[PDB]
Amino acid sequence: LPFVQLFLEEIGCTQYLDSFIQCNLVTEEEIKYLDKDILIALGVNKIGDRLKILRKSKSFQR
Amino acid sequence: LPFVQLFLEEIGCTQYLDSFIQCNLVTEEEIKYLDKDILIALGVNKIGDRLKILRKSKSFQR
User: Fold this and answer.
1) What angle do CA B11, B14, B19 make, to 5 degrees?
2) Inter-chain contact A36–B36, Cβ cutoff 8 Å?
3) Chain B neighbors of A35, CB-CB under 8 A
4) Chain A closest CA to B29's CA: distance in Å?
5) Mutate: best of B37, B44, B46, partner A, most A CBs <10 A
6) DSSP for B13-43?
7) Nearest 5 degrees, angle CA B20-CA B61-CA B34?
8) CATH number for the domain including A13?
9) Could you list the residue range(s) of the whole structural domain that residue A20 is in?
10) Domains in chain B, number
11) For the SAM domain, which residue ranges apply (chains A, B)?
């Protein structure tokens, strides 16, 4: 019962829900099993925060 | 042994020398711990290849 929403809420990325669901980041693993260039492509050209998600994406260890 | 040019040339980043040297990616480690946002911010907004560098970036171990 994953909820990337609860995660994006911490990384203030409420505008990355329908964006992540498209790229496939609605899981607590997909983000941990992906890259950052995927986010930017996901539809988040917003340079900067993108780097944050990069680190947050790793927030998952398992 | 700073020769990222050899590696950047293998990934096709001939136009990332003065860019990498700016951020400090002229080492076989700096890029080993860099992100896509770091590259895009480095001066490579070129969406796409960025992901490649992100992958090759990991090409570095020790």
Assistant:
1) 105
2) yes
3) 36, 51, 54-55
4) 18
5) B37
6) -GGGHHHHHHHT--STTTGGG--HHHHHHHT
7) 35
8) 1.10.150.50
9) 1-62
10) 1
11) 1-62
